[PDB]
Amino acid sequence: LPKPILRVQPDSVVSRWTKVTFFCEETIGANEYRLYKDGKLYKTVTKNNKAEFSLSNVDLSNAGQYECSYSTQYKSSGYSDPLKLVVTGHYWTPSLLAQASPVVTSGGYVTLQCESWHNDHKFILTVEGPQKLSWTQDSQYNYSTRKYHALFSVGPVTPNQRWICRCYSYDRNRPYVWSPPSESVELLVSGNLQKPTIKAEPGSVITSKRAMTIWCQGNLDAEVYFLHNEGSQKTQSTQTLQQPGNKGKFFIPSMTRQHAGQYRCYCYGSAGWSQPSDTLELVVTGIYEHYKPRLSVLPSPVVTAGGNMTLHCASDFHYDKFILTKEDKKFGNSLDTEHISSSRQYRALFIIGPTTPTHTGTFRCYGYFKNAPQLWSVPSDLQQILISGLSKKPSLLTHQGHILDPGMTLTLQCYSDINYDRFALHKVGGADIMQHSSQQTDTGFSVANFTLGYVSSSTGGQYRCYGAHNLSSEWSASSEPLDILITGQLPLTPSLSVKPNHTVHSGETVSLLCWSMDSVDTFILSKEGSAQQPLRLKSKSHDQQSQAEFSMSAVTSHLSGTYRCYGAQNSSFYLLSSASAPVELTV
């Protein structure tokens, strides 16, 4: 019979009072297995090819050499190579933990629990001060954690003394006398002096794994600043930058989940403790990366001053609440998410009161859950809001004509008699807003180049322009609407007709007509170099053909003539048909 193999989990060197299991692996199938400890029968396991020997809570006596044997009814033969099980004792140093938090109001108590691995009857808590205060407690035994502990209630805490606690344990009459001390647990006292001002230089919202600093500047007689996280964390700083005034540095290399939450600066000085700082809430983003939210604005990203505006942030994921932020700073408050039964979206409408110039900026929305208020989602694609104002209306004129072809490039241009430092272009129905600086032309007024790429079907619409000053943050009023029309998209093609003679006199009249057998809702007259708004007429169909009369009264030589006519439908108000054969009239 082949020799068996004995395994141990965990490793052969185990700490005291920890469960261990002996695994006896054998390829043959054995009716029973026998574990021999130091040459004596210790255990016997029957059935279940591998058998286990569980030794929960290993004591010092259980340490030694072990052997496993496997047996069949017909024969047993093999003894395994012995594996030495070694038990390691525990340290005598006790553990001192603020059972609630180091925060204490003046004249109050904070409960501290001191645990250790001693059979010692009594524990001691001492405070580092001119007078030495001691508390003596008996050791209680917790059967679940298998550890001896004792709770202390230090106090009453006076706001003039610095409280640093250390724990000791001993027995009354044993040679080893006292145990080594625990780690110093310092209490945070809510004094009566003036509160320090806590700030965050990068901001209160930081993406994960990035650096940030937390500084609180308080009284000039301070000595030590404490940065207490409400997630039960505490950082201590003594060396503070003296210039200018007392400023306590707290640096975090990379933000994680354990660094988010509310923070308060506690301050001890020459005149005692001080009132705690304001609750600065830190927020770590970059979690929940899969479902990025999306934000949009109604009715337009540019609204008049003092008007209704509703921002809409929704996500396919079941977020609990949505929070809006402007720039890197929090904005407004949190709103619950509403589950639309149809669109499968969790919605939240950020209704805003009468608009103010302060609302102008860059908005983002985040998603998070109630159980983790400081763990936000990935930021959403930014949505820029620009509230208009009551300044003088700039003018938006277009080189190269209104009605364009796909193969030409349009560069929009906005100017204003008032010296505006910056101009903004907006397309009605769009979301993005383009901002360009203004250059001082020789005529003395500002001019902004708004370059636009190759004209495509999307480019047609309505463009408005706004002005602003450098120091100012309030934008101007809207500029007169600008209709950009795109030709050559609709298959239908109209035909043009002229009523009278080609050579009309300086006072003659001409009613022209463009008609088409195919259905056309509106017709548009175009002039060569039509920098002017083309004339739009609805179409009245006497025959199966749609037609429209563009009457001309008291024509002049400047009006050389009218050349092409275009068709349009109600489905797309500003996407025009192809051109009609040109017709040149001469006055």
Ligand X SMILES: *[C@@H]1O[C@H](CO)[C@@H](O[C@@H]2O[C@H](CO)[C@@H](O)[C@H](O)[C@H]2NC(C)=O)[C@H](O)[C@H]1NC(C)=O
Ligand Y SMILES: *[C@@H]1O[C@H](CO)[C@@H](O)[C@H](O)[C@H]1NC(C)=O
Within positions 333 to 362, which residues make up the interface with a copy of itself, using CB under 8 A? Answer: 333-334, 336, 356-358
> Which residue has the CB atom at the shortest distance from ligand Y?
501
The DSSP code for 204 is S
CB closer to a copy of itself out of 299 and 306: 306
Q: Going by C-beta distance under 8 Å and a sequence separation of 6 or more, which residues neighbour residue 247?
A: 215, 216, 217, 240, 241
439 binds, among ligand Y, ligand X, a copy of itself, none (CB under 5 to 8 A by kind): ligand X
Spatial separation of the C-alpha atoms in residues 94 and 124, rounded to whole Å = 10
Minimum CB distance to ligand X smaller for 413 or for 580: 413
**Shortest spacing between CB 548 and ligand Y, in angstroms:** 24
Does 326 sit near a copy of itself (CB under 8 A)? no
Q: Which is nearer to ligand X, 160 or 437 (CB)?
A: 437
Amino acid at 585: L
CA separation for the pair 206, 379 (Å, rounded): 11
458 binds a copy of itself, rule: CB under 8 A: no
Say if residue 75 is exposed, middle or buried (CB neighbours under 10 Å; 0-12, 13-18, 19+).
exposed
Q: How far is the CB of 413 from ligand X (least distance, A)?
A: 6
d(CA 189, CA 103): 6
User: Binds 356, which of ligand X, ligand Y, a copy of itself, none (CB < 5 to 8 A, cut-off by type)?
Assistant: a copy of itself
> Which of ligand X, a copy of itself, ligand Y, none interacts with 12 (beta carbon under 5 to 8 A by kind)?
none
Q: How far apart are CA 195 and CA 216, in angstroms?
A: 10
Considering the rule CB under 8 A, would residue 389 count as an interface residue with a copy of itself? yes
Looking from the CA of 331 toward its CB, the CA atoms found within 13 Å total: 18
Pick one of ligand Y, a copy of itself, ligand X, none as the site partner of residue 447 (Cβ within 5 to 8 A by kind). ligand X
Q: Which residue has the tokens 């983003």?
A: 285
Measuring CA to CA, how many Å separate 557 from each of 527, 551, 562? 14, 16, 12
- Nearest residue (CB) to a copy of itself, 43 versus 393: 393
Question: Toward ligand X, which CB reaches closer, 300 or 413?
Answer: 413
- Supply 61's token pair: 């006596």
Cα separation, 28 vs 30, in Å, equals 6
> Taking Cα atoms as reference points, which of 311, 320, 359 lies closest to residue 339?
320
Q: Which is nearer to ligand Y, 362 or 586 (CB)?
A: 586
- Identity of the residue, 144 or 443, whose beta carbon is nearer to ligand X in the bound complex: 443
Q: 576, 461 in Cβ contact below 8 A?
A: no
Max CA pair span of the chain: 132
Nearer to ligand Y, 1 or 559 (CB): 559
State the binding partner of 181 from ligand X, a copy of itself, ligand Y, none, CB within 5 to 8 A by kind.
none
- Answer for which of 77, 192, 400, 457 binds a copy of itself (CB under 8 A) is 192
Paired tokens of 364: 């983002």
Bridge-based pairing of strands 205-207 and 280-285 is parallel
**CA 426 remoteness from chain centre:** 28
Q: Name the E strands within 128-232.
A: 134-138, 140-142, 147-154, 164-170, 185-186, 188-190, 197-200, 205-207, 212-217, 222-229
Q: Scanning the structure block, which residue is given the tokens 């001890």?
A: 268
Helix (H, G, I), strand (E, B) or coil at 196: coil
Size of the site for ligand X (CB under 6 A): 6
User: How far is the first Cα of the chain from the last one, in angstroms, to the nearest whole number?
Assistant: 123
Name which position in 5, 83, 151, 583 contacts a copy of itself (CB under 8 A).
Answer: 151
Site string for a copy of itself, 88-117 (x = CB under 8 A): -----------xxx-xxx-xxxxx------
d(CA 121, CA 138): 5
Q: Which of residues 412-451 bind a copy of itself (CB under 8 A)?
A: 418-419
Interface residues toward ligand Y, by CB under 6 A:
501, 503
Q: Least distance in Å: CB of 446 to ligand X? A: 9
Site string for ligand X, 406-435 (x = CB under 6 A): -----x-x----------------------
Residues that bind ligand X (CB under 6 A): 399, 411, 413, 439, 447, 449
Write out the residues near a copy of itself by the rule CB under 8 A: 99-101, 103-105, 107-111, 151, 153, 155-157, 190, 192-195, 197, 219-220, 230, 232, 262, 271, 275-276, 278-279, 281, 305-306, 321, 333-334, 336, 356-358, 370-371, 373, 389-392, 418-419, 469-474
